[PDB]
Coordinates of N, CA, C and O in Angstrom, one line a residue:
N2 N 0.8 -1.3 0.0 CA 0.0 0.0 0.0 C 0.8 1.3 0.0 O 1.1 1.9 1.1
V3 N 1.2 1.9 -1.2 CA 1.7 3.3 -1.3 C 0.7 4.2 -2.1 O 0.0 3.8 -3.0
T4 N 0.7 5.5 -1.7 CA -0.1 6.5 -2.4 C 0.6 7.2 -3.4 O 1.8 7.6 -3.2
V5 N 0.0 7.5 -4.6 CA 0.8 8.2 -5.6 C 0.0 9.4 -5.9 O -1.2 9.3 -6.3
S6 N 0.6 10.6 -5.9 CA 0.0 11.8 -6.2 C 0.3 12.0 -7.7 O 1.4 12.0 -8.1
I7 N -0.8 12.2 -8.5 CA -0.7 12.3 -10.0 C -1.0 13.8 -10.4 O -2.0 14.4 -10.0
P8 N -0.1 14.3 -11.2 CA -0.3 15.8 -11.6 C -1.4 15.9 -12.6 O -1.7 14.9 -13.3
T9 N -1.9 17.1 -12.7 CA -3.1 17.3 -13.5 C -3.0 16.7 -14.9 O -3.7 15.8 -15.3
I10 N -1.9 17.1 -15.6 CA -1.5 16.5 -16.9 C -1.6 14.9 -17.1 O -2.2 14.5 -18.1
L11 N -1.2 14.2 -16.1 CA -1.4 12.7 -16.1 C -2.7 12.1 -15.6 O -2.9 10.9 -15.7
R12 N -3.6 12.9 -15.1 CA -4.9 12.3 -14.6 C -5.8 11.6 -15.6 O -6.6 10.8 -15.2
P13 N -5.6 11.9 -16.9 CA -6.4 11.1 -17.9 C -6.1 9.6 -17.7 O -7.0 8.8 -17.6
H14 N -4.8 9.3 -17.5 CA -4.4 7.9 -17.4 C -5.1 7.2 -16.2 O -5.2 6.0 -16.2
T15 N -5.5 8.0 -15.2 CA -6.1 7.5 -13.9 C -7.6 7.9 -13.8 O -8.1 8.0 -12.7
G16 N -8.3 8.0 -14.9 CA -9.7 8.4 -14.9 C -9.9 9.7 -14.2 O -10.9 9.8 -13.5
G17 N -9.0 10.6 -14.3 CA -9.1 11.9 -13.5 C -8.9 11.8 -12.0 O -9.1 12.7 -11.3
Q18 N -8.4 10.6 -11.5 CA -8.0 10.6 -10.1 C -6.7 11.4 -9.8 O -5.7 11.2 -10.5
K19 N -6.8 12.2 -8.8 CA -5.8 13.1 -8.2 C -4.7 12.2 -7.6 O -3.5 12.7 -7.5
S20 N -5.1 11.1 -7.1 CA -4.3 10.2 -6.2 C -4.7 8.8 -6.4 O -5.9 8.5 -6.5
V21 N -3.7 7.9 -6.5 CA -4.0 6.5 -6.7 C -3.1 5.7 -5.8 O -2.0 6.2 -5.5
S22 N -3.4 4.5 -5.6 CA -2.7 3.5 -4.8 C -1.7 2.7 -5.7 O -2.1 2.4 -6.8
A23 N -0.5 2.3 -5.2 CA 0.3 1.4 -6.0 C 1.2 0.5 -5.1 O 1.0 0.5 -3.8
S24 N 2.1 -0.2 -5.6 CA 3.1 -1.0 -4.8 C 4.3 -1.5 -5.6 O 4.2 -1.8 -6.8
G25 N 5.4 -1.6 -4.9 CA 6.7 -2.1 -5.5 C 7.7 -1.9 -4.5 O 7.6 -1.0 -3.6
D26 N 8.8 -2.6 -4.6 CA 9.9 -2.3 -3.7 C 10.8 -1.1 -4.2 O 11.5 -0.4 -3.4
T27 N 10.7 -0.8 -5.5 CA 11.4 0.3 -6.0 C 10.6 1.2 -6.8 O 9.4 0.9 -7.2
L28 N 11.0 2.4 -7.1 CA 10.3 3.4 -7.9 C 10.0 2.7 -9.3 O 8.9 2.9 -9.8
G29 N 11.0 2.0 -9.8 CA 10.8 1.2 -11.0 C 9.5 0.3 -10.9 O 8.7 0.3 -11.8
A30 N 9.4 -0.4 -9.8 CA 8.4 -1.4 -9.6 C 7.0 -0.8 -9.4 O 6.0 -1.4 -9.8
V31 N 7.0 0.4 -8.9 CA 5.8 1.2 -8.7 C 5.3 1.7 -10.0 O 4.2 1.6 -10.4
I32 N 6.3 2.3 -10.8 CA 6.0 2.7 -12.1 C 5.3 1.6 -13.0 O 4.3 1.8 -13.6
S33 N 5.9 0.4 -13.1 CA 5.3 -0.6 -13.9 C 4.0 -1.1 -13.3 O 3.1 -1.7 -14.0
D34 N 3.8 -0.9 -12.0 CA 2.5 -1.3 -11.4 C 1.4 -0.3 -11.8 O 0.3 -0.8 -12.2
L35 N 1.7 1.0 -11.7 CA 0.7 2.0 -12.2 C 0.3 1.7 -13.6 O -0.8 1.9 -14.0
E36 N 1.3 1.3 -14.4 CA 1.2 1.1 -15.8 C 0.2 0.0 -16.0 O -0.8 0.1 -16.8
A37 N 0.4 -1.1 -15.2 CA -0.5 -2.2 -15.1 C -1.9 -1.7 -14.9 O -2.8 -2.1 -15.7
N38 N -2.2 -0.9 -14.0 CA -3.6 -0.4 -13.7 C -4.0 0.8 -14.6 O -5.2 1.0 -14.6
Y39 N -3.1 1.5 -15.2 CA -3.4 2.9 -15.7 C -2.5 3.1 -16.9 O -1.6 3.8 -16.9
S40 N -3.0 2.5 -18.0 CA -2.2 2.2 -19.2 C -1.8 3.6 -19.8 O -2.6 4.5 -19.9
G41 N -0.5 3.6 -20.1 CA 0.0 4.8 -20.9 C 0.8 5.8 -20.1 O 1.5 6.6 -20.6
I42 N 0.5 5.7 -18.8 CA 1.1 6.5 -17.8 C 2.7 6.5 -17.9 O 3.4 7.5 -18.1
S43 N 3.2 5.3 -18.0 CA 4.6 5.0 -17.9 C 5.5 5.7 -18.9 O 6.5 6.4 -18.6
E44 N 5.2 5.6 -20.2 CA 6.0 6.2 -21.3 C 6.1 7.7 -21.0 O 7.1 8.3 -21.4
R45 N 5.2 8.3 -20.3 CA 5.2 9.8 -20.2 C 6.2 10.2 -19.1 O 6.6 11.4 -19.0
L46 N 6.7 9.2 -18.3 CA 7.6 9.5 -17.2 C 9.0 9.2 -17.5 O 10.0 9.7 -16.9
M47 N 9.2 8.4 -18.6 CA 10.5 7.9 -18.9 C 11.2 8.7 -20.0 O 10.5 9.4 -20.8
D48 N 12.5 8.7 -20.1 CA 13.2 9.4 -21.2 C 13.0 8.5 -22.4 O 13.5 7.3 -22.4
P49 N 12.4 9.0 -23.5 CA 12.3 8.3 -24.8 C 13.6 7.9 -25.3 O 13.8 6.8 -25.9
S50 N 14.6 8.8 -25.2 CA 16.0 8.5 -25.7 C 16.6 7.3 -24.9 O 16.7 6.2 -25.5
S51 N 17.0 7.5 -23.7 CA 17.7 6.4 -23.0 C 16.9 5.7 -21.9 O 16.3 6.3 -21.0
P52 N 17.0 4.3 -22.0 CA 16.1 3.4 -21.1 C 16.4 3.4 -19.6 O 17.6 3.4 -19.2
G53 N 15.4 3.5 -18.8 CA 15.6 3.3 -17.3 C 15.8 4.7 -16.7 O 15.7 4.8 -15.4
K54 N 16.0 5.7 -17.5 CA 16.3 7.0 -17.0 C 15.0 7.8 -17.2 O 14.3 7.6 -18.2
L55 N 14.7 8.6 -16.2 CA 13.5 9.4 -16.1 C 13.6 10.6 -17.1 O 14.7 11.0 -17.5
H56 N 12.4 11.1 -17.4 CA 12.3 12.1 -18.4 C 12.9 13.5 -17.9 O 12.7 13.8 -16.7
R57 N 13.5 14.2 -18.7 CA 14.2 15.5 -18.3 C 13.2 16.4 -17.6 O 13.7 17.1 -16.6
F58 N 12.0 16.5 -18.0 CA 11.0 17.5 -17.5 C 10.0 16.9 -16.6 O 8.9 17.5 -16.3
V59 N 10.3 15.8 -16.0 CA 9.4 15.2 -15.0 C 10.3 15.1 -13.7 O 11.4 14.6 -13.7
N60 N 9.7 15.5 -12.6 CA 10.2 15.3 -11.3 C 9.4 14.1 -10.6 O 8.2 14.0 -10.8
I61 N 10.1 13.4 -9.8 CA 9.5 12.4 -8.8 C 10.2 12.4 -7.5 O 11.3 12.3 -7.4
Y62 N 9.4 12.7 -6.4 CA 9.8 12.6 -5.0 C 9.3 11.3 -4.4 O 8.1 11.0 -4.6
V63 N 10.1 10.7 -3.6 CA 9.5 9.6 -2.7 C 9.6 10.3 -1.4 O 10.6 10.8 -0.9
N64 N 8.4 10.5 -0.8 CA 8.3 11.2 0.5 C 9.1 12.5 0.6 O 9.7 12.7 1.7
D65 N 9.1 13.5 -0.3 CA 10.0 14.7 0.0 C 11.5 14.5 -0.4 O 12.2 15.5 -0.3
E66 N 11.9 13.3 -0.7 CA 13.3 13.1 -1.2 C 13.2 13.0 -2.7 O 12.4 12.2 -3.3
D67 N 14.1 13.8 -3.4 CA 14.2 13.8 -4.8 C 14.9 12.5 -5.3 O 16.0 12.3 -4.9
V68 N 14.2 11.7 -6.1 CA 14.8 10.4 -6.5 C 16.1 10.5 -7.3 O 17.0 9.6 -7.2
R69 N 16.2 11.6 -8.0 CA 17.5 11.9 -8.7 C 18.7 11.9 -7.6 O 19.8 11.9 -8.1
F70 N 18.4 11.9 -6.3 CA 19.5 11.8 -5.4 C 19.5 10.5 -4.6 O 20.4 10.3 -3.8
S71 N 18.6 9.6 -4.9 CA 18.5 8.4 -4.2 C 18.6 7.1 -5.1 O 18.3 6.1 -4.7
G72 N 19.0 7.3 -6.4 CA 19.1 6.2 -7.3 C 18.0 6.1 -8.4 O 17.9 5.0 -9.0
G73 N 17.3 7.2 -8.6 CA 16.2 7.1 -9.6 C 15.2 6.0 -9.5 O 14.5 5.9 -8.4
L74 N 15.1 5.1 -10.5 CA 14.1 4.0 -10.4 C 14.5 3.0 -9.4 O 13.7 2.1 -9.0
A75 N 15.8 3.0 -9.1 CA 16.3 2.0 -8.1 C 15.9 2.5 -6.7 O 15.9 1.7 -5.8
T76 N 15.5 3.8 -6.5 CA 15.1 4.3 -5.2 C 14.2 3.3 -4.4 O 13.1 3.0 -4.9
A77 N 14.6 2.9 -3.3 CA 13.8 1.9 -2.4 C 12.5 2.5 -1.9 O 12.4 3.8 -1.7
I78 N 11.5 1.7 -1.8 CA 10.1 2.1 -1.5 C 9.5 1.3 -0.3 O 9.4 0.1 -0.3
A79 N 9.1 2.1 0.8 CA 8.7 1.4 2.0 C 7.1 1.4 2.1 O 6.5 2.2 1.4
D80 N 6.6 0.5 2.9 CA 5.1 0.6 3.0 C 4.7 2.0 3.6 O 5.4 2.5 4.5
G81 N 3.6 2.5 3.1 CA 3.1 3.9 3.5 C 4.0 5.0 3.1 O 3.8 6.1 3.6
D82 N 5.0 4.8 2.3 CA 5.7 5.9 1.6 C 4.7 6.6 0.7 O 3.7 6.0 0.4
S83 N 5.0 7.8 0.4 CA 4.2 8.5 -0.6 C 5.0 8.8 -1.9 O 6.3 8.9 -1.7
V84 N 4.4 8.9 -3.0 CA 5.2 9.2 -4.3 C 4.5 10.4 -4.9 O 3.3 10.6 -4.9
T85 N 5.3 11.3 -5.5 CA 4.8 12.5 -6.1 C 5.4 12.8 -7.4 O 6.7 13.0 -7.5
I86 N 4.6 12.8 -8.5 CA 5.0 13.1 -9.8 C 4.6 14.6 -10.1 O 3.4 15.0 -10.0
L87 N 5.6 15.3 -10.6 CA 5.4 16.7 -11.0 C 6.1 17.2 -12.2 O 7.3 16.9 -12.4
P88 N 5.4 17.9 -13.1 CA 6.1 18.5 -14.2 C 7.3 19.3 -13.7 O 7.1 20.1 -12.7
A89 N 8.5 19.2 -14.3 CA 9.6 20.1 -13.9 C 9.3 21.5 -14.4 O 8.6 21.7 -15.4
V90 N 9.8 22.5 -13.6 CA 9.8 24.0 -14.1 C 11.3 24.6 -14.1 O 12.1 24.4 -13.2

């Protein structure tokens, strides 16, 4: 049980839900899980150029920690952690 906050731009993939539930031990695992339930979400978060690397203009925090500082998709994920996707500015 982790909660994922979805930014306005990606709510189509989630039937307009602001927030959805997911699970995985890593950010990677949570991403492909959301994909599982909410088709098309995933390509929008990844860099089209190089695999496994997040998109230049997307931010993702696991609980207030920027994943770019904790291993990106390898970033470890605990029960009741929260995840937050946001367009970069």
